[PDB]
Amino acid sequence: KQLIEFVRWSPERAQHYRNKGYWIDQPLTRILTVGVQSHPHSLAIICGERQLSYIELDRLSTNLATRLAEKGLGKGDTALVQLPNVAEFYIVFFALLKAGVVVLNALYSHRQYELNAFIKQIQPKLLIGSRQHEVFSNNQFIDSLHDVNLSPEIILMLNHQATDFGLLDWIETPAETFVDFSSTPADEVAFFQLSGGSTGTPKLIPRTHNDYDYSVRASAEICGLNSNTRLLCALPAPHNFMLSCPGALGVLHAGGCVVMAPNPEPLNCFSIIQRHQVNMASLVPSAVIMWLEKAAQYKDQIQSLKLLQVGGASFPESLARQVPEVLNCKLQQAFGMAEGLVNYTRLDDSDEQIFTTQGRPISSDDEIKIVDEQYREVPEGEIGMLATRGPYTFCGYYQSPEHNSQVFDEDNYYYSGDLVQRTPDGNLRVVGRIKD
Ligand SMILES: O=C(O)c1ccc(F)cc1O
Ligand SMILES: [Ca+2]
Ligand SMILES: [Ca+2]
Ligand SMILES: [Ca+2]
């Protein structure tokens, strides 16, 4: 009956963020509902040989949601989802959003140790995974959960066994009986993001419908998405970068289409780009290097790429400059964190800004301090530690009061651990990382 706990913005900041129109108090399912009303038959997801329209995505994820409701899963409960880069990922995401189940999307690369830690932390009543994943290849991990009194009530499996509940069976058909359901309230937790770079297993980041939808809408505007955007989803779909910056959710917000790839391997990605005339992609620097190494051979297959976002690791200027020369598309640098703040070079920034900086915040109410070791603001342009708060930056990790008191200051700035300097033009350069 209690909704998932999380650390709230002050009411004065919530009001401000509503007054500015950042927080519009709609569930994240707004993206689907609006697109179904506007363009039900536009393609939402391309996955392998499948073409999911907006109304198909909407009907498939309602089916799953009615099935879960039928089982007493709803507001107050949590789910652990671990799916590869396939359409069912988003069907499941929107299904849990619709049903009011707070979902943690594990990376498909996470193994038993991480999944165990997540299950201990959110005690999910629903687990959704794939039988082709190493961890669910046998029944050992699911069995270990009974021992520890953490068995979920429902396990749905992709590529399922005859014994299992088939995830695709619960998507294909709605429940036999009607049980009511609804999203969690727009200013309550919608789902858990995961931190990057924390010491042990990733820390849980509660995200509300209000703040995630804002970052998605605002990112989609900055990146200039529209209904002809076709975005390659080659990075892990659950990752903040791939999901909201502007990510699949931004593309759906804009009425475009997400094109799935299993991973960023260049030859296969290039084939998907050519086949579906992908015009946007998002990559981390190591994946850009791989593409850069094949792109001359395949210039023709990737001509349609119009925009490449790059972020997630340091991206030297020498490499940035190769993106337009070799990939024949525009560069946008992105520096963000699942905890909130996202920076983009703008599409009309100068070439030097795009090649040498990681841009500037989504929001004019993204507040930045760049501080020395005495936590005093450095002189303009020097390197300091980044601290930030704003309308989509979280206010604390899930159930971690001790850690939270260490990375938030008294004004509720979050200390991301990133080292940065502000350039004269107003943009940020990420130059490193600092501990504790
Ligand atoms: O987590 C990251 O490293 C990351 C990178 C770019 C972006 F736009 C958002 C992000 O969360
Ligand atoms: Ca907005
Ligand atoms: Ca981080
Ligand atoms: Ca191009």
Author numbering: 3 to 438
The paper states:
Acinetobacter baumannii produces the catecholate siderophore acinetobactin to scavenge iron, a nutrient essential for several metabolic processes. The biosynthesis begins with BasE, a standalone adenylation domain, which activates and loads 2,3-dihydroxybenzoic acid (DHB) to the phosphopantetheinyl arm of the PCP domain of BasF. Adenylation domains have two subdomains, a large N-terminal subdomain (Acore) and a smaller C-terminal subdomain (Asub), which is highly dynamic, adopting unique conformations to carry out each individual step of the adenylation reaction. Several binding pocket residues were identified within 5 Å of the ligand, including Asn242, Phe243, Ser247, Val336, Val344, and Tyr346.
We solved the structures of the V336A and V336G mutants, which showed a general improvement in activity with the C4-substituted substrates from our panel and the structure of the V336A/S247C double mutant, which showed some of the highest activities among our mutants bound to 4-fluorosalicylic acid. Finally, the most dramatic improvements in catalytic efficiency were observed for the double mutant V336A/S247C, which had a ∼40-fold improvement for 4-fluorosalicylic acid and a ∼100 fold improvement for 4-methylsalicylic acid. The activities of this double mutant with 4-fluorosalicylic acid and 4-methylsalicylic acid were comparable to that of WT BasE with its native substrate DHB. These improvements in catalytic efficiencies were mainly attributed to the significant reduction in apparent KM observed with the mutants indicating that the mutagenesis likely improved the binding affinities of these substrates. The mutant S247C and the double mutant S247C/V336A showed reduced catalytic efficiency for DHB by more than 10-fold. The double mutant had significantly higher activity for salicylic acid (∼3-fold) emphasizing the importance of the hydrogen bond formation between the Ser247 and the C3 position hydroxyl group of DHB. We then analyzed the structure of the double mutant V336A/S247C, which exhibited both an increase in space in the binding pocket and the introduction of the cysteine residue observed in aryl adenylating enzymes that bind salicylate. This mutant demonstrated some of the highest increases in specific activity and showed improved catalytic efficiencies with the 4-substituted analogs, comparable to WT BasE for DHB. When combined with mutations that switch the specificity code of BasE to prefer salicylic acid, this activity can be further improved and be comparable to the activity of the WT enzyme with its native substrate DHB.
